[PDB]
Amino acid sequence: KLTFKTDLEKLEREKAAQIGVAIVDPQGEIVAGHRMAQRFAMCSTFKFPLAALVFERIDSGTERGDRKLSYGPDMIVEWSPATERFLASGHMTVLEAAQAAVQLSDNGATNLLLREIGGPAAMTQYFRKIGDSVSRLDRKEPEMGDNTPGDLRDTTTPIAMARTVAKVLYGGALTSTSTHTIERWLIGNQTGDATLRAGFPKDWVVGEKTGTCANGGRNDIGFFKAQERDYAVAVYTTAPKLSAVERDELVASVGQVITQLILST
């Protein structure tokens, strides 16, 4: 823990980075953090809470998971791998889109869901409903990831987002069935193999959602189980000078710092 602070500050100094971290227990009590209340662009990490919103609607009966969402070529935006494959068929279901958003970071799928649920305003309203007064979605993809220096649009803080993760996975925000499904989606995420989970012990159960945005943003949020201890984690980083591979390695390095702290308990 001053090993934790010290090691993160050395990474910041050496990589010319800012590293925001919060680790909380299942009830949201603080385990560790660093720059934990500094705002960072969310970029694709918001797709996890978006999926949670969708599952809340499914739980409540105001959405159906197998409902077909129709679209054309105008919905294809940069990095829409599933949406592009399903384009000729003319639709994705709510659940197909949500799973693609979480596991592939599919932007088109994300925007399909945004239009169904009420846009950025409704995403922000869900954050407020589950006790998160900080996280805000202002735009759809891909402009939400512009990350213009100083802009508070489309931001969160590590602590706010870690607490949101814990509410969704551990705090009863979703039914048991929906909670389990989203947990499995996070475990099976296809975009995180080089980021946080690359820095955790291989026996920990880990699920996460990555983000990449302009001006150096590289993020990863999710959960881990170190044997029986469950945690929620949010990592937001800004490293304008690094290459993309170096930013992945940065986040994996944060995972190793986290791991030293957890192992010490």
Side-chain angles (χ1 to χ4, degrees), residues 1-224 226 228-264:
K1 261 145 109 260
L2 288 82
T3 297
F4 175 85
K5 175 176 173 61
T6 300
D7 281 355
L8 293 177
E9 289 173 345
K10 175 186 178 79
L11 287 170
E12 290 188 338
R13 293 192 284 89
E14 290 190 324
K15 299 305 180 191
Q18 295 181 348
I19 301 168
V21 182
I23 311 166
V24 303
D25 89 345
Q27 292 77 29
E29 303 170 354
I30 294 167
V31 170
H34 187 74
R35 302 176 178 260
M36 74 187 70
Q38 178 175 337
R39 278 62 70 83
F40 295 79
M42 283 193 293
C43 70
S44 297
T45 66
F46 93 97
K47 295 164 186 176
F48 168 28
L50 176 63
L53 171 56
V54 171
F55 283 109
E56 192 221 44
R57 295 170 68 85
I58 289 169
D59 288 344
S60 305
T62 56
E63 185 53 271
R64 200 163 59 63
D66 292 340
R67 188 166 73 84
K68 300 182 175 63
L69 312 179
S70 290
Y71 65 94
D74 59 284
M75 283 289 316
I76 306 304
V77 299
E78 60 162 10
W79 193 254
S80 302
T83 307
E84 284 165 354
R85 290 175 191 124
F86 286 108
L87 177 67
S89 82
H91 70 278
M92 288 182 75
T93 68
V94 170
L95 281 169
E96 282 170 338
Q99 192 175 345
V102 171
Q103 299 192 315
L104 292 169
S105 216
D106 188 311
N107 282 322
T110 299
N111 286 349
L112 199 59
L113 296 165
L114 284 172
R115 60 155 169 72
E116 294 305 314
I117 53 99
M123 182 71 254
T124 302
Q125 264 290 304
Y126 180 73
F127 281 127
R128 298 296 172 273
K129 184 202 175 137
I130 67 171
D132 179 347
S133 62
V134 173
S135 308
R136 51 182 290 183
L137 190 70
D138 296 85
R139 296 172 286 180
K140 69 174 159 74
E141 297 281 12
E143 325 69 275
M144 73 78 69
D146 280 5
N147 192 205
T148 302
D151 188 0
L152 293 176
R153 289 176 296 181
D154 302 296
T155 58
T156 185
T157 63
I159 188 63
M161 188 58 74
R163 282 173 168 159
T164 285
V165 172
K167 263 168 209 159
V168 170
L169 296 179
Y170 305 122
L174 298 176
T175 59
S176 76
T177 300
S178 292
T179 303
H180 188 69
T181 294
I182 208 171
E183 281 186 1
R184 301 292 289 176
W185 287 1
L186 290 166
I187 296 166
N189 172 39
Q190 300 184 48
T191 66
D193 288 353
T195 49
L196 271 185
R197 69 207 292 160
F200 289 155
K202 305 234 261 122
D203 53 340
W204 289 8
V205 182
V206 186
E208 43 63 52
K209 177 73 200 82
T210 53
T212 304
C213 51
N215 298 316
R218 194 74 169 107
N219 312 319
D220 208 358
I221 71 168
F223 75 95
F224 59 89
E228 275 178 43
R229 308 289 258 99
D230 300 330
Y231 300 90
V233 58
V235 173
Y236 289 89
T237 74
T238 310
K241 301 247 200 251
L242 293 185
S243 69
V245 177
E246 289 171 336
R247 293 179 189 122
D248 292 353
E249 297 175 347
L250 181 63
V251 179
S253 290
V254 174
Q256 290 166 246
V257 177
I258 293 167
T259 298
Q260 184 169 9
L261 172 80
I262 300 296
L263 290 184
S264 78

